[PDB]
Write a protein that binds this ligand. Structure first.
Ligand SMILES: C[C@H](CCC(=O)O)[C@H]1CC[C@H]2[C@@H]3[C@H](O)C[C@@H]4C[C@H](O)CC[C@]4(C)[C@H]3C[C@H](O)[C@]12C
Ligand SMILES: C[C@H](CCC(=O)O)[C@H]1CC[C@H]2[C@@H]3[C@H](O)C[C@@H]4C[C@H](O)CC[C@]4(C)[C@H]3C[C@H](O)[C@]12C
Lengths: 202, 202
């Protein structure tokens, strides 16, 4: 199929882009470095492949989509779970994701685009909020026969993942603070789930 | 006093550095631009004034020190306050600080040093943790005759300020998400203090 070939060729470009980004550095790599190694899989690529920034955000699209589905499964294997249970399930899969070197490496790239006058980053975030994993958490909140949990469901989902994630990711990205190993992950999820569900008065 | 003159001259350098950073841009400004406008208040300045990065972190030192004392006062004007009260007091002063354009502007500068091979940023954080406002919160936690609150006091202080601050500051800095006005600040502090003290089961 010609369409399979198109998608194969795009996959080649992105893989090249990522190899460069990881190897040469995002800042050091230009679009032309990418085109040169893409060879004859890149003539002109019209499907948003018009820049280094766009290639990066194409790659980020994929990664976001896979994190989402991985985290969905973890929660899906829940049998009438308590709120505690599904929060803990989600917590563990979410926190594990942000404790891979991958997440910090992409983190650095994003932080470095703080002064980019192009704002591909703003467009990317604006244009795929639906693809973010907090939406999974939002969905359960609404299914709680609790009026506080349903009216605030988005805000609660964001709160919880923030408690799990920060300021650690931030410090990982900015100064290369060490990642959490698995024990520490579990520890922090339990710590956070308790406060979130129960408050510190207890 | 010769010592007063020294400190005056340093204050001139930093003010010049900041004016440049704000006006020309941190990335566009070099040390020599700073020295040129510093004129005869900068011959050679030996007290860590050896680079653009160091000047920035000198300025950040001051700002951090003032945020700390402002937030201390707010909590100091508390008469045997409940945990709710002093958390709310602290919340309001902390959240207000991060909703000034200043905080976002400095935020951007820091994010842009993500690839700096010099790591002045890591040294700065490592070398003045004591000066961070979360220490104020840590202090009250230990004065609670609660064993959970004292053993975890640092972790709880960091948690709370994180709930107040993120992911908003992050989005302010990365994509220029709008700041919170005062109503929204108060709203968010109350929202957060409730969950923190009481959990979502209620
Ligand atoms: C997964 C992805 C990039 C890969 C990573 O660095 O690991 C991260 C980086 C920046 C993140 C976004 C923002 O920086 C932070 C926001 C936090 C809230 O949970 C909403 C999602 C939120 C809008 C994030 C969604 C997503 O997880 C992002 C896009
Ligand atoms: C106030 C100061 C810079 C000014 C700002 O951008 O407004 C901010 C920027 C980065 C912040 C630091 C980190 O990025 C985040 C950390 C969060 C925890 O509360 C510990 C303090 C913590 C280590 C922060 C302390 C402080 O408030 C910093 C240094």
């Amino acid at each position: 199929t010609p369409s399979q070939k198109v998608l194969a060729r795009q996959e080649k470009i992105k893989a090249v882009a990522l190899e460069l980004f990881l190897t040469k550095g995002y800042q050091e790599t230009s679009l032309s470095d990418i085109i040169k190694l893409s060879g004859g899989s890149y003539s002109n690529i019209y499907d948003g492949f018009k820049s280094k920034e766009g290639l990066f955000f194409e790659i980020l699209d994929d990664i976001c989509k896979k994190h989402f589905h991985l985290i969905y499964s973890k929660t899906q294997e829940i049998k009438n779970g308590t709120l505690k249970e599904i929060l803990t399930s989600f917590g563990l899969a979410f926190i594990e994701i942000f404790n891979q070197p991958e997440a910090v490496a992409f983190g650095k790239i994003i932080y470095s685009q703080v002064y980019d006058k192009d704002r591909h980053l703003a467009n990317w975030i604006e244009n795929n909020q639906q693809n973010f994993s907090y939406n999974i958490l939002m969905g359960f909140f609404k299914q709680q026969n609790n009026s506080y949990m349903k009216k605030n469901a988005e805000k609660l989902a964001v709160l919880f993942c923030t408690m799990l994630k920060e300021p650690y990711h931030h410090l990982n990205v900015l100064i290369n603070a060490p990642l959490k190993n698995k024990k520490e992950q579990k520890e922090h999820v339990e710590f956070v789930v308790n406060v979130f569900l129960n408050g510190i008065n207890s």
